[PDB]
A paper describes a structure:
Structurally, CD98hc is a type-II-transmembrane glycoprotein which is disulfide-linked to one of six known multi-pass CD98 light chains (CD98lc), all of which are permease-type amino acid transporters with different specificities 3, namely Lat-1 4, Lat-2 5, y+Lat-1 6, y+Lat-2 7, asc-1 8 and xCT 9. First, it acts as a molecular chaperone for membrane trafficking, stabilization and proper function of the CD98lc 10, 11, thus boosting the transport of amino acids and contributing to cell survival and growth. Second, CD98hc directly contributes to intracellular integrin signaling and is involved in integrin-mediated cell to cell interactions via cellular adhesion molecules, such as VCAM-1, thereby influencing cell growth, survival, spreading and migration 15-19. Anticalins constitute an emerging class of artificial binding proteins obtained by combinatorial design based on the compact and robust human lipocalin scaffold 48.
To identify the epitope region and to understand the structural mechanisms of the tight molecular interaction between P3D11 and the CD98hc ectodomain, we crystallized this lipocalin variant in complex with hCD98hcED (carrying an N-terminal Strep-tag II) after isolation of the 1:1 complex via SEC. Crystals belonged to the space group C2, with two complexes per asymmetric unit, allowing collection of a synchrotron X-ray data set and refinement of the structure to a resolution of 1.8 Å. The engineered lipocalin binds to a membrane-distal part of hCD98hcED via the four variable loops #1-#4 at the open end of its β-barrel. The β-barrel axis of P3D11 is tilted by ~45° with regard to the TIM barrel axis of hCD98hcED. The contact interface between both proteins involves a buried surface area (BSA) of 1473 Å2 (1424 Å2 on the side of the lipocalin and 1521 Å2 on the one of hCD98hcED) as well as 15 hydrogen bonds and 3 salt bridges, resulting in the largest interface observed for Anticalin•protein complexes thus far 71. The interaction is favored by electrostatics as P3D11 is positively charged, which complements the predominantly negatively charged epitope on hCD98hcED, also reflecting the calculated pI values of 8.8 and 5.2 for P3D11 and hCD98hcED, respectively. The epitope of hCD98hcED essentially comprises two loops, L1 (residues 128-137) and L2 (374-404), which follow on the first and the eighth β-strand of the TIM barrel, respectively. Almost 75% of the contact interface is contributed by L2, which penetrates deeply into the binding pocket of the engineered lipocalin, while L1 contributes approximately 20% to the total BSA. Interestingly, binding of P3D11 causes an induced fit on the side of hCD98hcED.
Numbering used by the authors:
A (entry chain B): 114 to 529
B (entry chain A): 7 to 178
Write the structure that this text describes.
Amino acid sequence: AQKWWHTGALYRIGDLQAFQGHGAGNLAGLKGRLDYLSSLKVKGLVLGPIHKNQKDDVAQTDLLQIDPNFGSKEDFDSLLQSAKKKSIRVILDLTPNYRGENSWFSTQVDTVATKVKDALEFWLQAGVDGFQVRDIENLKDASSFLAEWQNITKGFSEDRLLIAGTNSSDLQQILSLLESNKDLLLTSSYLSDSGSTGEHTKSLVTQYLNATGNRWCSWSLSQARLLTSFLPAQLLRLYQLMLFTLPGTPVFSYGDEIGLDAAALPGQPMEAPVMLWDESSFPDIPGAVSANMTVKGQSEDPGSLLSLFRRLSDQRSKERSLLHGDFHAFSAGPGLFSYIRHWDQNERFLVVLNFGDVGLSAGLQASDLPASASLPAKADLLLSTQPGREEGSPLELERLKLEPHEGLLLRFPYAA
Amino acid sequence: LIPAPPLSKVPLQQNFQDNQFHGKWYVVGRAGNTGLREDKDPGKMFATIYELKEDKSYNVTYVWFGQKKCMYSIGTFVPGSQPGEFTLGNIKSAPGRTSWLVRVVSTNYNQHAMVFFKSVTQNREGFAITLYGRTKELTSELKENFIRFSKSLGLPENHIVFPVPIDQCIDG
């Protein structure tokens, strides 16, 4: 019964050429990366846009035709059938003026909206699993158009998804978009650029859930940009642990799994960096790409960001409490954010996050939770974000001490 | 996919003078199969500094503007078989490791240079060509000479990009 997009992470690929790196940068090349994508346990890919768009020219934009530099309609149908065999879903980005400065054009809004409307049934017939539209701050009467497009997509099948993206970070603006659209999945800047205290992140997360009836939602730092656009390297591991264990669908962009940072090499486009598969990525700068920046190098190191991403994604896509669970937060100290995930009679998870730069005792208070919950004296450590602890062994909960920037994931069974 | 050219198609600058090639070069053009394209953001310009050492190696420093600060990376180019060819030093000896060849194709030392790069990883080869300038801008004619050579090695013109000049960091 549970909808497919509830079952794990979504993975955005906006620039097909930069993702592939080598060769031609087409739909065929993407198909040859599906074994890698399956290794990440991601449940859906968000692709493109890939349609014909003469920059700023409404008449020479056609959402029904693939731009021949990306490949053919036969290459697209082959990509969909191979993704299906690997249990990976496919979402098509239809943002119409993707090659221009304004994504929605500057004129003829009724003509532009009709292009999106008329492309929905065409692509659902081809076998896509849903759609993404971005930059909806620039779309006039967005809440009405989104309701219409949702009703067409769900009318085809309740197992089809519409994702909307906005640059907004404002709670009131987001609430007014969703008021008549309560089931839409929305990505936004709600969590980016508010300074990062443990207490402030706890306030953002709790107030959002309290305002929206604990309904299903996404968790992300942006509608499109990399985590390293917003966060220093020392908080990346902590944020991945939080995103994979909050109640909702986590959404990443290509390279987030290796900590891809556009600033870390000479010559990377700041908003669309080349994916670093191995040390041969940029042959014109010998010595610049080190092994620890790359997919090949990170796959050989149990302590890497990619190894952590893979483990967390595994847990998110198999543990019923992380799939379906309720959520309750503690009010821990300055520096800390801590919470529990729990469902019916399945294994429970405790998450403890130290956002600060000093070592801390957690002194978690049981009475912060509702009367009917309770904690055991000890819980088995599943993992830490930092090396050197004994996994699989119990830790005593009244006594936890966390190092600077450390996150812990603990587990405990259903006891009646 | 575009296969690497044989090294027998790649010219070597005659009579190469290592002491004239030293100093700062701006990366004015980049041609290869990396994902960069003429129809989209080509990136910000960076500099490559060649410091000649007593054993005829170069210490090579890359200088660029990162998020809100200047950024640096350093490596050693070890002389190869002929004057004007180099390899990358301080490389691992595990059997899957990447190796490099650098060949200076054409330079007048005080204005422009074209350099060819080849990587080898297991059985797989990668390549690029760079257009260097002593200044951040070069003439239409010199850029066309670089376009013509890159195309002769099998690259489409849309695989050739010209990074945007900036003033942060790259002018010491």
